[PDB]
Amino acid sequence: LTSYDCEVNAPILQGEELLRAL
Amino acid sequence: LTSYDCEVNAPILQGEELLRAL
Amino acid sequence: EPREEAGALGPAWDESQLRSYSFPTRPIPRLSQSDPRAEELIENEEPVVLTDTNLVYPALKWDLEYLQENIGNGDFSVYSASTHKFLYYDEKKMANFQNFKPRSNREEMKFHEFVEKLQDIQQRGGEERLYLQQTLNDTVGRKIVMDFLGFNWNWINKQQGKRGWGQLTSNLLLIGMEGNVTPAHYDEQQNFFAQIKGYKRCILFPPDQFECLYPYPVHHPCDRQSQVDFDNPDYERFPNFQNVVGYETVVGPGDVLYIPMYWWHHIESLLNGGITITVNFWYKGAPTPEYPLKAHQKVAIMRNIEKMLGEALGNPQEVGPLLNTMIKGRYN
Amino acid sequence: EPREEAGALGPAWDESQLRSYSFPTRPIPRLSQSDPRAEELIENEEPVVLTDTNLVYPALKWDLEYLQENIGNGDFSVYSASTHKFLYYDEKKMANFQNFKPRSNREEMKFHEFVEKLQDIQQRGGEERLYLQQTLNDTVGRKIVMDFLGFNWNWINKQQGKRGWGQLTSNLLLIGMEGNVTPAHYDEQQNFFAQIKGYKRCILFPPDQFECLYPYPVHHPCDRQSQVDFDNPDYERFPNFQNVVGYETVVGPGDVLYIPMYWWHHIESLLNGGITITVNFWYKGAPTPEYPLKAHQKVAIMRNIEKMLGEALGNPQEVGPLLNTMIKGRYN
Ligand SMILES: O=C(O)CCC(=O)C(=O)O
Ligand SMILES: O=C(O)CCC(=O)C(=O)O
Ligand SMILES: [Fe+2]
Ligand SMILES: [Fe+2]
Numbered sequence: 001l002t003s004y005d006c007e008v009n010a011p012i013l014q015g016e017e018l019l020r021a022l
Numbered sequence: 023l024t025s026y027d028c029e030v031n032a033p034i035l036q037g038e039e040l041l042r043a044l
Numbered sequence: 045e046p047r048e049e050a051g052a053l054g055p056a057w058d059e060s061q062l063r064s065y066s067f068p069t070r071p072i073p074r075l076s077q078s079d080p081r082a083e084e085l086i087e088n089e090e091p092v093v094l095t096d097t098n099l100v101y102p103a104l105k106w107d108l109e110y111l112q113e114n115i116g117n118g119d120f121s122v123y124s125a126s127t128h129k130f131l132y133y134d135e136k137k138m139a140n141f142q143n144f145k146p147r148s149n150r151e152e153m154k155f156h157e158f159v160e161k162l163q164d165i166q167q168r169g170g171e172e173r174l175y176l177q178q179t180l181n182d183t184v185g186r187k188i189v190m191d192f193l194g195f196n197w198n199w200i201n202k203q204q205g206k207r208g209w210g211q212l213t214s215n216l217l218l219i220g221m222e223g224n225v226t227p228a229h230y231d232e233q234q235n236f237f238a239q240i241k242g243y244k245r246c247i248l249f250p251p252d253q254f255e256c257l258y259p260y261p262v263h264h265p266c267d268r269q270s271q272v273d274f275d276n277p278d279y280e281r282f283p284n285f286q287n288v289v290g291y292e293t294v295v296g297p298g299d300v301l302y303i304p305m306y307w308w309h310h311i312e313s314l315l316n317g318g319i320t321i322t323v324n325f326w327y328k329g330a331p332t333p334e335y336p337l338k339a340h341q342k343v344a345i346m347r348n349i350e351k352m353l354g355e356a357l358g359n360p361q362e363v364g365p366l367l368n369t370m371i372k373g374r375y376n
Numbered sequence: 377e378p379r380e381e382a383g384a385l386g387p388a389w390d391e392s393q394l395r396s397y398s399f400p401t402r403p404i405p406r407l408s409q410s411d412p413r414a415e416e417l418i419e420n421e422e423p424v425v426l427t428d429t430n431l432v433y434p435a436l437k438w439d440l441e442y443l444q445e446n447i448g449n450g451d452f453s454v455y456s457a458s459t460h461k462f463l464y465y466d467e468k469k470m471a472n473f474q475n476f477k478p479r480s481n482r483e484e485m486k487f488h489e490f491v492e493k494l495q496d497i498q499q500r501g502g503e504e505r506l507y508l509q510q511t512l513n514d515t516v517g518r519k520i521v522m523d524f525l526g527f528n529w530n531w532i533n534k535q536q537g538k539r540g541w542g543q544l545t546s547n548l549l550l551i552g553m554e555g556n557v558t559p560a561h562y563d564e565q566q567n568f569f570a571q572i573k574g575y576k577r578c579i580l581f582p583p584d585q586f587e588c589l590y591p592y593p594v595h596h597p598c599d600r601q602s603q604v605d606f607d608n609p610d611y612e613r614f615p616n617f618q619n620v621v622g623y624e625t626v627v628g629p630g631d632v633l634y635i636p637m638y639w640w641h642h643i644e645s646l647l648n649g650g651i652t653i654t655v656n657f658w659y660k661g662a663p664t665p666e667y668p669l670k671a672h673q674k675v676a677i678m679r680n681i682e683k684m685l686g687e688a689l690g691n692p693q694e695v696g697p698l699l700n701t702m703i704k705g706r707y708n
Binding site: 254255258259260261271281282283284335337342345346349350352353356357358363364366367368369370371372373374375376 | 587603698
């Protein structure tokens with residue numbers, strides 16, 4: 001009930017994936 | 023969420039158990 | 045219109061024996077158990093009075109003398125009150141609502157003690173009221189055992205089977221004084237309510253009248269009971285009580301009222317009608333399997349939300365404030 | 377009091393460049409990244425402006441010309457509006473609220489197209505406003521790739537590790553026109569907000585101000601955004617907005633604002649301050665493991681109840697009426 005999602009003011013490579021690829 | 027318990031205006035042999043024993 | 049007792053013994057009761065309330069009602073159908081319409085009503089979870097089941101035929105001879113003589117030496121729960129209203133309360137929930145002060149008290153006694161108590165009140169013209177409410181169990185005596193086995197199990201077992209109900213959890217014996225009232229509430233089990241002695245007026249409301257009946261919070265001791273005082277309705281706190289509409293009937297010896305699970309019911313022993321005796325048959329409902337959702341399914345949902353919130357917040361008193369914070373300026 | 381730009385270049389901005397609102401605020405602390413108090417604030421999920429992280433040091437030279445020349449030929453989401461307010465909305469939720477009419481529209485274009493559009497508005501004295509908001513991805517060019525790799529990963533990776541955060545989900549590039557506003561909302565991720573060009577006034581509210589900020593229903597497209605129009609607050613619908621108290625700061629090039637998960641934030645590009653550029657860093661929060669519950673945990677709870685009800689009732693529009701039916705005359 002205390003669990004949460006990860007929504008932000010933006011739609012769902014990027015982030016960690018972008019960085020490593022680079 | 024639609025699931026239900028079995029509470030009534032009485033506290034929790036009797037019922038089916040009483041009948042069979044008898 | 046009050047039925048006529050066989051052998052021209054006159055009306056079983058009259059209007060003056062009924063209490064007066066603010067809402068209208070329509071009659072619950074009284075039908076034969078062999079009548080297909082009765083089966084249709086039960087199947088659909090709608091109330092019906094069955095007049096000829098012979099469900100508790102052997103108990104029709106029961107009276108205080110016979111029961112005192114044969115019901116054994118087990119303990120019996122007897123509620124005592126100074127009002128005609130016997131509002132049910134769950135003792136286990138009392139710790140979480142320290143400010144709740146019950147208007148009735150429970151006492152455990154032997155049957156002969158209950159009878160003696162009833163006798164002393166009568167003789168001394170006391171205003172005290174008693175209501176015995178005790179699950180039938182293994183300590184009852186042989187004659188009661190014989191009577192119980194003579195109940196119409198064939199008929200009721202078929203009902204249980206036809207409706208997919210769960211097990212019989214219990215049979216509550218209710219012995220009340222004239223004028224006693226069990227205030228409106230709903231139970232989460234299916235109930236065949238078998239009248240034995242005297243007359244009881246039963247007023248039922250469908251589950252879709254939840255908004256008009258204002259049940260206490262789930263964690264309050266009076267969970268499942270209506271907060272509305274039917275004798276003095278507070279329309280400021282409970283405005284939709286002005287829209288409530290009941291289904292009513294008066295049951296007597298031999299009658300069986302099907303009180304469907306989640307249906308609200310208010311039950312009163314007729315004024316000046318003497319003591320009443322009833323035995324109910326409580327069965328767990330069928331399993332939860334389609335839209336649109338039924339009223340009773342929404343009730344189940346609301347109860348679950350209340351329960352989960354109570355557990356997650358760690359304090360049931362925090363349920364209200366969170367609920368309010370959720371809706372104000374957002375959903376209301 | 378507005379800081380002084382090095383080399384006696386005068387005040388970075390003045391009061392007249394800030395919009396006027398109905399509530400008071402206190403300043404967010406501006407501190408060095410080496411200052412233990414900064415670490416204490418982040419650890420405690422409280423906002424802080426860090427002045428010397430060098431988080432996006434290589435991006436400080438970014439401007440429209442450099443970006444147009446190097447950011448590649450990928451698509452960029454650009455919002456267009458006729459108001460200064462860029463209320464965020466979730467397109468996937470639009471089907472369930474047919475009556476919601478967005479005040480801003482999204483268009484996908486190439487970077488050079490965004491720039492050209494900005495140019496045409498300026499020249500024609502148009503009142504239209506644009507806001508580019510695009511996640512940085514694999515199509516950016518080599519120079520941008522070089523800049524991005526030059527971000528202070530050492531420092532931010534340690535933060536991620538120290539706080540037990542989940543993964544970096546993305547970096548949003550925001551390029552706005554002067555006067556643009558992103559209305560108050562909260563995000564469910566941790567955010568280091570790294571200012572690059574121009575100045576942005578950031579007003580934050582703690583999660584315990586939920587009752588004063590009136591977020592839309594969870595299933596509405598503006599889930600997580602405040603329903604209150606900060607420019608014309610309707611105190612009849614949102615009475616507790618009269619009790620709101622913010623934490624504010626103005627960030628400029630080189631500054632990084634920690635916007636803790638669940639903290640409300642209202643962000644505005646200073647009036648007459650030219651275009652702004654920001655790059656954020658969004659990280660999933662730590663895992664959910666003790667009473668008393670934190671404000672943000674209660675928020676999580678309320679969101680979940682709303683979500684479950686929406687799914688169980690099969691129609692999100694039924695959420696309100698059930699919630700109301702649950703509380704009136706019972707918890708309110
Ligand atoms: O007869 C009564 O007073 C109450 C019975 C009742 O509420 C029930 O059998 O469910
Ligand atoms: O800078 C803005 O206009 C909004 C940024 C925002 O809301 C965020 O980074 O979470
Ligand atoms: Fe009942
Ligand atoms: Fe945000």
